[PDB]
Write a protein that binds this DNA or RNA. Structure first.
Lengths: 129, 49, 52, 174, 79, 50
RNA sequence: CGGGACCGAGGACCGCGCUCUGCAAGGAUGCUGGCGUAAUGGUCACCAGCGACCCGUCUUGAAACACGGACCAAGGAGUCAA
């Protein structure tokens, strides 16, 4: 994989080489590529110090760098928003374009005839014996 | 509901008549008054309002 | 000049809600339940309740 | 641990595409209220069936009232309590008129005799001793004895605490 | 001993602030130290704890074992 | 006036509807799981310190 | 439906209203008594209950240590010029 400047990458140092890592803070962090080398890459990371963000730069080998999927959902949602909006304009019917948080469950009825409940104790009697 | 609740100012209640539980800063299921108490919030609303 | 409690002053209740007088006269806070003989609880509910 | 009620709590795993009808689990929980009963029910399922509250639901919460609260009964309680050594089994007996009163007497008894709290006690079984010969403990055996009759020696009279001074020395014979 | 007639100097139960703070710090450092040794504990631990079982003085232990057998035979027949 | 009358009637009907659904499930030998609550009142009972 | 305490802000009318000759509806009025003076009120001294380390400076993160202070009157220290 040939990485390019401006690409957003994830840092995952594979292997159990955590005995002598100088900086374990950037493991699992996501940053922007500014410099490309054959076996190295320059990553811009932002750290939070109290109320402000400080900007740090690291040099990570390509073996610990994978492309990130941060904007995949945004570009995808833009695409079906455009497509369903075109479809809604075609068929003349309103449609929802906004994703919503999970709503509480409604009322429903659970049958008992084939699903008789099992009475449980705080310990299992099979374990007691 | 968003517009109605944001139109409503936050309610400034008084301290409950009869008080809190003896150890106030524990969970409701532990014998305190923090956390979710489900339909038991109505008695606290009567006491504080 | 003075906020008056509508739950203590009936005039503020009638100003904010004209249906309060109709509610009080028709006693809509004391509506009895619908008539009819209630069917008894099924037995299997009782054995499920009292099952050890 | 308070004015306890016994609740039948039935819950289940949330239905999925793989499992459209999950199994239902029923427990008898002695709790002060329904919120505590549901919390203890989910705690026991996390301990046993690995079913979390966030992925499960409560189907039913009901109150189990005593059938005959006016009949004197003997109750045997098999329980486990946690101390600094670890977990221990205990079987105890209580002469009460309801299961909930037996459980409150149990909780007070364990707190008094072993300093065990609510979270350190697990109630495994509460049973009715239907026959007199099923009673094992001597402190219940002496109470279920034939023709039980005893006096009450040295009864201090009940005098109001606001009446500071008395004119005659009280008697402790009635 | 002649404690009744000639008692010695009393042992004060009134704590001092320096002693209370020092004892609290010692308790905190002991908790952190036993947590660290629990993390670096080389002693073998069982995956499943030893369960004591049912007490013998329980009057319905035999019918509980009967319930266990009918449950396990029912499970074996179902499986 | 008419709107308050409608609201009072709706509250009474929704309460009787929940009771009727629970009774129908109990009579048919099942349990009616009520809908989860949609409104929560939250009160801050601890101070602004630490 | 009672029993109790504290409060009376504003000062022609306007408004929302209702039980609509009027009103408990955008903030207290009506009736009555004693006194008309140290009676209310205020100041000073003292007693009583409760509360309350001696100020300034230095130090460090802070206390402590250290330094100054017998009392009073007058004087007494970020000014001017480029």
């Amino acid at each position: 994989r040939t990485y390019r400047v401006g690409d957003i990458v994830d840092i995952k140092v594979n292997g159990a080489v955590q005995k002598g890592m100088p900086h374990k803070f950037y493991h699992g962090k996501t940053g922007v590529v500014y410099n490309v080398t054959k076996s190295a890459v320059g990553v811009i990371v932002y750290k939070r110090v109290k109320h402000r963000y400080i900007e740090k730069r690291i040099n990570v080998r390509i073996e610990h760098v994978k492309p990130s999927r941060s904007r995949e959902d945004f570009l995808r949602r833009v695409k079906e928003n455009a497509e369903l909006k075109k479809k809604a304009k075609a068929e003349g019917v309103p449609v929802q374009l906004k994703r919503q948080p999970a709503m509480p469950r409604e009322a429903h009825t659970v049958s008992i005839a084939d699903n008789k409940p099992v009475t449980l104790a705080p310990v299992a009697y099979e374990t007691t014996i | 509901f968003k517009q109605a609740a944001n139109f409503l100012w936050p309610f400034k209640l008084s301290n409950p008549n009869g008080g809190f539980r003896p150890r106030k800063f524990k969970h409701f299921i532990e014998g305190g008054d923090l956390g979710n108490r489900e339909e038991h919030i109505n008695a606290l609303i009567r006491a504080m309002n | 000049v003075q906020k008056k409690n509508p739950l203590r002053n009936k005039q503020i209740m009638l100003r904010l809600n004209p249906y309060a007088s109709t509610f009080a006269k028709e006693k809509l806070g004391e509506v009895k339940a619908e008539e009819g003989k209630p069917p008894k609880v099924p037995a299997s509910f009782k054995e499920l309740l009292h099952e050890a | 641990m308070g004015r306890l009620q016994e609740y039948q709590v039935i819950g289940r795993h949330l239905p999925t595409e793989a499992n459209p009808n999950p199994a239902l689990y029923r427990m008898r929980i002695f709790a002060p209220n329904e919120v505590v009963a549901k919390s203890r029910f989910w705690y026991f399922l996390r301990g046993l069936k690995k079913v979390k509250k966030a992925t499960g639901e409560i189907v039913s919460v009901n109150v189990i009232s005593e059938k005959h609260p006016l009949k004197v009964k003997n109750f045997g309680i098999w329980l486990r309590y946690d101390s600094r050594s670890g977990t221990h089994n205990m079987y105890k007996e209580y002469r009460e008129t309801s299961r909930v009163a037996a459980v409150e007497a149990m909780y007070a008894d364990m707190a008094a005799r072993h300093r065990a709290r609510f979270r350190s006690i697990h109630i495994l079984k509460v049973v009715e001793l239907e026959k007199t010969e099923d009673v094992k403990r001597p402190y219940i055996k002496q109470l279920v004895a034939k023709n039980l009759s005893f006096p009450l020696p040295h009864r201090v009279p009940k005098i109001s605490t606001k009446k500071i001074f008395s004119a005659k020395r009280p008697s402790t014979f009635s | 001993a002649g404690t009744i007639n000639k008692p010695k100097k009393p042992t004060s139960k009134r704590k001092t602030t320096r002693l209370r703070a020092k004892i609290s710090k010692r308790a905190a450092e002991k908790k952190r130290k036993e947590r660290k040794l629990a993390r670096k504990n080389p002693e073998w631990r069982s995956k499943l704890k030893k369960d004591p079982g049912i007490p013998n003085l329980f009057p319905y232990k035999e019918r509980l074992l009967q319930q266990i057998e009918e449950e396990r035979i029912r499970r074996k027949e179902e499986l | 006036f008419k709107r308050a009358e409608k609201y009072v009637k709706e509250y009474r009907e929704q309460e009787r509807e929940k009771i009727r659904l629970a009774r129908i499930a109990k009579q048919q030998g099942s349990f009616h799981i009520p809908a989860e609550a949609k409104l929560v009142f939250v009160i801050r009972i601890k101070g602004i310190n630490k």
